[PDB]
Design a protein around this ligand. Structure first.
Ligand SMILES: CC(=O)O[C@H]1C(=O)[C@@]2(C)[C@H]([C@H](OC(=O)c3ccccc3)[C@]3(O)C[C@H](OC(=O)[C@H](O)[C@@H](NC(=O)c4ccccc4)c4ccccc4)C(C)=C1C3(C)C)[C@]1(OC(C)=O)CO[C@@H]1C[C@@H]2O
Ligand SMILES: Nc1nc2c(ncn2[C@@H]2O[C@H](COP(=O)(O)OP(=O)(O)OP(=O)(O)O)[C@@H](O)[C@H]2O)c(=O)[nH]1
Ligand SMILES: Nc1ncnc2c1ncn2[C@@H]1O[C@H](COP(=O)(O)OP(=O)(O)NP(=O)(O)O)[C@@H](O)[C@H]1O
Ligand SMILES: Nc1nc2c(ncn2[C@@H]2O[C@H](COP(=O)(O)OP(=O)(O)O)[C@@H](O)[C@H]2O)c(=O)[nH]1
Ligand SMILES: [Mg+2]
Ligand SMILES: [Mg+2]
Lengths: 432, 451, 386, 38
């Protein structure tokens, strides 16, 4: 029986984790205080994946919270699901990084990393058979990028066999919120490409587009975006917690998705997303979910899949349905869109089906693609990186905390090599 | 605990401090005598915010403020005013003559014998503080105390504390308007300390604020109280992000990290968008787009310099009130398409954004209207060089004939201290002219190997 | 130039003698013939290599390749090139039990020593031999290992930590904080060699009583300086000798590994698979643009997929002169691995390099401009314009 | 009697020699190619 240890870093990671724990506690019928008030017996059968059991017949999530600003922890505690977390896992300091990757990684995070690792060891030693970790953080910020990369490196040093997932919010194409996003993004991606098994790319602009065009929300806030990301996160690990006709562990997805070690950047998606207004018009069937999942408008990464090819894709369905229809629809999607799939990976569509659907939906599905179009994202960052590194636009803030130009140059080189590796499959007609 | 020490030097500093502390006491519900009835009425809370007030056992709240001046008049007005019981009885007032518009008098002769007491009080305040963030120094170029004593204080603080941030709000002399004959000498001499020791220096101009208070807030005969209130609103917008909650929260270190490309160009402009009177508060939506556009209007700048004559190097937008991130993103996208607003090619992002839930307050008897949204924009740009260049010309016109020089040398300076400072000033100007230039065409000259 | 390829056959081992011991390798001149023990009717497929060493029959003198013959063929020439000014690499290859450590390390107590003792020794007896008032030499020695995707220092005192790997923009990948020491006589470097061999991680297995559990790299940084104010240049030459001992492939069925041994074998096989992939990709890339037209459009090479190929980026291609010494087992039971080793040696024969090595590029430009001035002045004088 | 001094610049000998040799090469090459001897 498998566990997942959960780590949260930075403001974005903390908020996404809070919403994720609210979505999971609903699916399992845990009340905002730790007591179980469910109806289906299957909810408690595999509750050990996320929750430890307390002495009072209460359930405590196996979560770890990290930051260098107490404000985020205070906001989390003073909330609907603040008391559910145990207070010993609230690890934090003072004098935050201030959007400085060097402070997060080298100067300030080097002191708090020991405490975070102590709590991680305490949580990890209590599992019957640990599966892997998952981390939520933002690449474009300060403490998020630095502490996330440092914790990933330390854990991979200590736990080489286990799985390391990551739900990272990358800088957007034209939307921006800090001046120095490219530096932090480049360094964080340089750290992630070596020391991770999977990495789900999330973009704010894609989520805004989903909120505006698909769900027709007039005034979307960060809560909605957290909602989507949280539905994706639950949908990923459904098969660990509920029975299904054809299960799919995390290792199954990792094996069937990545062809080569350095290509583990996944574009996620979810269906069915309607409009609270047209729910009565669209019939819910497997063809409709398949149509919505592969739509370019529905991706959360802000990279058009039609500009590249799918190395691999994985579809995880939840709800009673027929395997014949699912397999036929996957074959149909491959056959019609023959130009968007590589020719040297025959039948590159992983399928999983879980019996128990979400709370009030008859059927649902989540999509995990691995396309060369993701290269575009990196190129954008790389372009902006050059535009500042050539003149040393803000470099004194980073060199003052114990870094040098060599680190920046090698990170840029790693980014460019990654982009070239994705490019070298992008074109058709492998001969000449 | 995000805590700051405010230091007020000179008449301008003390009066701006009066306005600022009125605003802070109104913001946190603190009475003029230091008591807060809100906690007693409710039962408790964090309303005794540690950013600006230290709480004693009895429930009184003392500001984390240091006032300094060489005259007793301006501070004696505060010792017997409405807020006589708010401040600690220390006010660090030298019972002697003043700097007399002379930099040397305030830096060398009479600046001594009072710096030690000021530093002792600052150390006492800092000892009580946990997790100190930085300093907020208020002064004014062109004055004797506000230039020389501020220079000495900044030098000693940089020697002692070193790593803590030091933000500086200063009143640069106006192009045409002035209230003294020897403003250029003091303003140029302050360049040394305002350059090397300070971390970020915000400049405001009296002519610009007079223009604003005559087109926007329709007042025809303003006084210094209105100017101080507007500056207080600016400072409150800057400091709100470490007192109240918000969607995106910007600390004091993020300001320096995002607005300062190089150590020697830390002179950003500041502006407040929804400056409007109660009568004109109606007939106006005052959406996020409108205030964001008004921040970039040349007429609304707080320093008499045209941004269209230069290039924007960095921007930092601080929103207050009922503001949603989507509208901010739309407004920034709209601004980025305008051709009149040019950004340096080496800063493609060029925007920092912060949102805070607390709306701005209304000082009783004030002039600003009650609004639901507001934004304060800081802009590090190259146009500020123009605002310096005029001053340099003025300095030359007085230094060719060595007018008013014997007063300065009679108090302990020498002639060379003038020229050196001027040379330093020139270097700063050239630095700006070096950074605003576009990157050379295909900056690796030209490239392209075989294939 | 291209990669130099040497193939060497070892004699039988106790396990091989205990079971079926029918040999399948034949070797003549510069040709190696393998015969399939399951298909005697099939053609004896043969391969061509630059060097071929039949060390099957020890006491004989008929085409027997001793250690010194292998050195005089490969390592001599490699040193000579090192003196000439090129960075030089020699790396071993094969399957487990092939005899890579014998070819490289050898037995210290006996006269039969592997390649590195011969070279570090000859070079000392040549520096010391040619030292002069103007000439001077400097040597620094380092020795690192790759255990499980982690770099460890062998000559350093006890330090359980792992060293970081950086990428200098011009010099390529390298290792940070590597304990690079200086040696002045042969006794010091022999002590370093003994300490490094003792420090290496070694475990026993069914295919070898003292199998290697980690890749190893022995690096000599060699500097030649000339002292004369009128004519000579100081620090005139700097070069690198890299000598690589690789851990061979393994099969869990015959290996009999359990637990940590199995993990070490899996990591070794992963690194060797990456090395094979980069070798094949390099071979195809250089062959195509050479033969096909000359397009040079684009060809990604997966250097970064493993730390071994990352550290040896400059040796497998670009700025180095490199030699590959493949070891081969004679027995019929190891036929499937021996054929794979031969195939990869043939593929490695197709790889090319681009090595020049110049020092102090300002001096390079200055001397080039001086030579251009002399040439143009002579041309003008010959044509009456000077 | 203030009089003009200008800036005194201490050039690197390496760059000085490189520039001088480049100028010499340029002059010699121009003379050779102008006569059609290259
Ligand atoms: C007609 C009806 O029953 O109402 C639906 C509804 O109208 C729709 C529009 C819902 C609704 O979702 C939204 O409107 C929405 C807005 C912004 C961001 C995210 C969602 C719904 O809120 C969402 C809600 O979904 C759930 O309750 C799922 O179990 C979901 N969990 C949560 O939403 C949740 C949130 C907070 C606390 C606890 C649970 C989930 C989905 C996948 C995996 C795990 C959990 C449902 C069925 C609906 C409403 C209520 C309108 C949709 O959401 C989901 C994931 O079901 C939006 O697209 C789907 C399609 C549904 O038809
Ligand atoms: N905005 C604003 N500026 C002020 C105010 N009071 C004084 N100033 C500025 O201060 C300048 C005069 O120099 P001061 O700063 O008063 O000099 P000081 O602090 O009194 O020190 P001394 O010269 O020794 O008396 C004027 O040019 C004003 O522009 C004020 O209340 N508001
Ligand atoms: N040519 C040879 N003559 C005599 N003995 C040899 C010869 N080659 C190898 N041996 C011996 O056979 C064994 C295997 O040699 P060795 O060089 O250690 O293999 P290896 O390269 O280490 N295999 P690996 O575990 O992948 O490193 C050792 O005991 C050697 O002494
Ligand atoms: N998706 C999402 N992104 C967020 C949220 N809050 C902040 N961000 C993003 O995070 C970036 C700023 O990084 P930040 O969170 O301050 O990093 P940190 O300081 O290390 O925690 C911005 O570009 C935002 O787009 C959120 O609730 N959801
Ligand atoms: Mg005064
Ligand atoms: Mg060996």
């Amino acid at each position: 029986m498998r566990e997942i240890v959960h780590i949260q870093a930075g403001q974005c990671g903390n908020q996404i984790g809070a919403k994720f724990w609210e979505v999971i506690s609903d699916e399992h019928g845990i009340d905002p205080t730790g007591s179980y008030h469910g109806d289906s017996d299957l909810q408690l059968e595999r509750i050990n994946v996320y929750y430890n059991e307390a002495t009072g017949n209460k359930y405590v999530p196996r979560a770890i919270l990290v930051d260098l600003e107490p404000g985020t922890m205070d906001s989390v505690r003073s909330g609907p699901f603040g008391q559910i977390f145990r207070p010993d896992n609230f690890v934090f300091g003072q004098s935050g990084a201030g959007n400085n990757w060097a402070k997060g990684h080298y100067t300030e995070g080097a002191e708090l990393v020991d405490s975070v690792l102590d709590v991680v060891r305490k949580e990890s030693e209590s599992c019957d058979c640990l599966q892997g970790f998952q981390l939520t953080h933002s690449l474009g910020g300060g403490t998020g990028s630095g502490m996330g990369t440092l914790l990933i490196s330390k854990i991979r040093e200590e736990y080489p066999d286990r799985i390391m997932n990551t739900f990272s919010v990358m800088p957007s194409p034209k939307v921006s919120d800090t001046v120095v996003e490219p530096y932090n993004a480049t360094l964080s991606v340089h750290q992630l490409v070596e020391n991770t098994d999977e990495t789900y790319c999330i973009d704010n602009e894609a989520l805004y587009d989903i909120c505006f065009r698909t769900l027709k929300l007039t005034t979307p806030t960060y809560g909605d975006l957290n909602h989507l990301v949280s539905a994706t996160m639950s949908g990923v690990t459904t098969c660990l917690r509920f029975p299904g006709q054809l299960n799919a562990d995390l290792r199954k997805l990792a094996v069937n998705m990545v062809p080569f070690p350095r290509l583990h950047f996944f574009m996620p998606g979810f269906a069915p997303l309607t409009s609270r207004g047209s729910q009565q018009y669209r019939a819910l069937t497997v063809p409709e979910l398949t149509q919505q999942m592969f739509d370019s408008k529905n991706m959360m990464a802000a990279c058009d899949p039609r500009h590249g090819r799918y190395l691999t894709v994985a579809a995880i369905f939840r709800g009673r349905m027929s395997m014949k229809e699912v397999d036929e629809q996957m074959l149909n999607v491959q056959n019609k869109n023959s130009s968007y799939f590589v020719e040297w990976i025959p039948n590159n569509v992983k399928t999983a089906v879980c019996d128990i659907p979400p709370r009030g939906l008859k059927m649902s599905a989540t999509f995990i693609g691995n396309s060369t179009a993701i290269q575009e994202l990196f190129k954008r960052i790389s372009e902006q990186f050059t535009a500042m590194f050539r003149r040393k636009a803000f470099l004194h803030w980073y060199t003052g905390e114990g870094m040098d130009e060599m680190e920046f140059t090698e990170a840029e080189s790693n980014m460019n090599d990654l982009v070239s590796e994705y490019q070298q499959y992008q074109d058709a007609t492998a001969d000449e | 605990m995000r805590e700051c020490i405010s230091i007020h030097v000179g008449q301008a500093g003390v009066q701006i401090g009066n306005a600022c502390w009125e605003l802070y006491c109104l913001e946190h519900g603190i009475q003029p005598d230091g008591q807060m009835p809100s906690d007693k009425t409710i039962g408790g809370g964090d309303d005794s915010f540690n950013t600006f007030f230290s709480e004693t056992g009895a429930g009184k709240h003392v500001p984390r403020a240091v006032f300094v001046d060489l005259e007793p008049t301006v501070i004696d007005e505060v010792r017997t005013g409405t807020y006589r019981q708010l401040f600690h009885p220390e006010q660090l007032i030298t019972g002697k003559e003043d700097a007399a518009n002379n930099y040397a008098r305030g830096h060398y002769t009479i600046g001594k014998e009072i710096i030690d007491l000021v530093l002792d009080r600052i150390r006492k305040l800092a000892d009580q503080c946990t997790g100190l963030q930085g300093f907020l120094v208020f002064h004014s170029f062109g004055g004797g105390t506000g230039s020389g004593f501020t220079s000495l204080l900044m030098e000693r603080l940089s020697v002692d504390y070193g790593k803590k941030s030091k933000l500086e709000f200063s009143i640069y002399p106006a192009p045409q308007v002035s209230t003294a004959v020897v403003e250029p000498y003091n303003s140029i001499l302050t360049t040394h300390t305002t350059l090397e020791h300070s971390d970020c220096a915000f400049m405001v101009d009296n002519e610009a604020i007079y223009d604003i208070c005559r087109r926007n807030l329709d007042i025809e005969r303003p006084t210094y109280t209105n100017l101080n209130r507007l500056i207080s609103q600016i400072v409150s917008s800057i400091t709100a992000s470490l007192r109240f909650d918000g969607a995106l929260n910007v600390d004091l270190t993020e300001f320096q990290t995002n607005l300062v490309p190089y150590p020697r160009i830390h002179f950003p402009l500041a502006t407040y968008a929804p400056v409007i009177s109660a009568e004109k508060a109606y007939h106006e939506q005052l959406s996020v787009a409108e205030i964001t556009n008004a921040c970039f209007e040349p007429a609304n700048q707080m320093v008499k310099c045209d941004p269209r004559h230069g290039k924007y190097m960095a921007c930092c937008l601080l929103y207050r009130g009922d503001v949603v991130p989507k509208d901010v993103n739309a407004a920034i996208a709209t601004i980025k398409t305008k051709r009149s607003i040019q950004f340096v090619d080496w800063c493609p992002t060029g925007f920092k954004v912060g949102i805070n839930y607390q709306p701005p307050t209304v000082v009783p008897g004030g002039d600003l209207a009650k609004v639901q949204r507001a934004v304060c924009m800081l802009s590090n740009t190259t146009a500020i060089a123009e605002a310096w260049a005029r001053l340099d010309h003025k300095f030359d016109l007085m230094y060719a004939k060595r007018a008013f020089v014997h007063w300065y040398v009679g108090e302990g300076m020498e002639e060379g201290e003038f020229s050196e400072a001027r040379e330093d000033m020139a270097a700063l100007e050239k630095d700006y002219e070096e950074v605003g230039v576009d990157s050379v065409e295909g900056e690796g000259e030209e490239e392209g190997e075989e294939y | 130039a291209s990669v130099k390829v040497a193939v060497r056959v070892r004699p039988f081992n106790s396990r091989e003698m205990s079971r079926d011991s029918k040999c399948i390798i034949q070797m003549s001149g510069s040709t190696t013939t393998i015969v399939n023990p399951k298909q005697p009717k099939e053609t004896p497929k043969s391969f061509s290599f630059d060097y071929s060493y039949w060390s099957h029959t020890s006491p004989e003198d008929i085409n027997y390749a001793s250690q010194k013959q292998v050195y005089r063929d490969i390592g001599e020439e490699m040193l000579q090139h090192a003196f000439e000014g090129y960075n030089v690499c020699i790396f071993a290859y094969g399957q487990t039990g092939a005899g890579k450590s014998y070819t490289m390390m050898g037995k210290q107590e006996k006269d039969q020593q592997g390649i590195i003792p011969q070279l570090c020794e000859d070079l000392f007896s040549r520096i010391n031999d040619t030292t002069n008032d103007n000439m001077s030499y400097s040597v620094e020695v380092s020795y690192m290992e790759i255990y499980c995707e982690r770099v460890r220092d062998l000559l350093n005192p006890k330090n359980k930590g792992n060293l970081r790997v950086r990428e200098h923009p011009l010099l390529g990948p390298y290792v940070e904080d590597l304990s690079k020491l200086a040696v002045t006589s042969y006794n010091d470097i022999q002590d370093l060699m003994d300490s490094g061999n003792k420090a290496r991680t070694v475990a026993a297995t069914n295919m070898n009583e003292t199998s290697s559990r980690s890749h190893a790299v022995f690096n000599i940084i060699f500097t030649q300086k000339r002292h004369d104010a009128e004519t000579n240049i100081t620090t005139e030459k700097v070069s690198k000798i890299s000598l690589v001992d690789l851990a061979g492939s393994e099969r869990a069925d015959s290996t009999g590994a359990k637990g940590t041994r199995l993990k070490e074998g899996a990591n070794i096989n992963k690194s060797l698979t990456t090395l094979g992939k980069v070798i094949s990709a390099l071979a195809e890339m250089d062959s195509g643009p050479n033969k096909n037209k000359k397009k040079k459009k684009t060809d990604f090479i997966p250097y970064r997929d493993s730390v071994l190929t990352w550290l040896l980026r400059e040796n497998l291609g670009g700025n180095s002169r490199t030699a590959m010494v493949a070891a081969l087992s004679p027995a019929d039971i190891n036929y499937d691995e021996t054929l794979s080793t031969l195939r990869y040696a043939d593929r490695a024969k197709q790889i090319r390099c681009n090595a020049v090595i110049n020092e102090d590029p300002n001096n390079k430009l200055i001397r080039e401009l001086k030579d251009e001035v002399t040439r143009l002045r002579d041309l003008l004088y010959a044509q009456g314009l000077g």
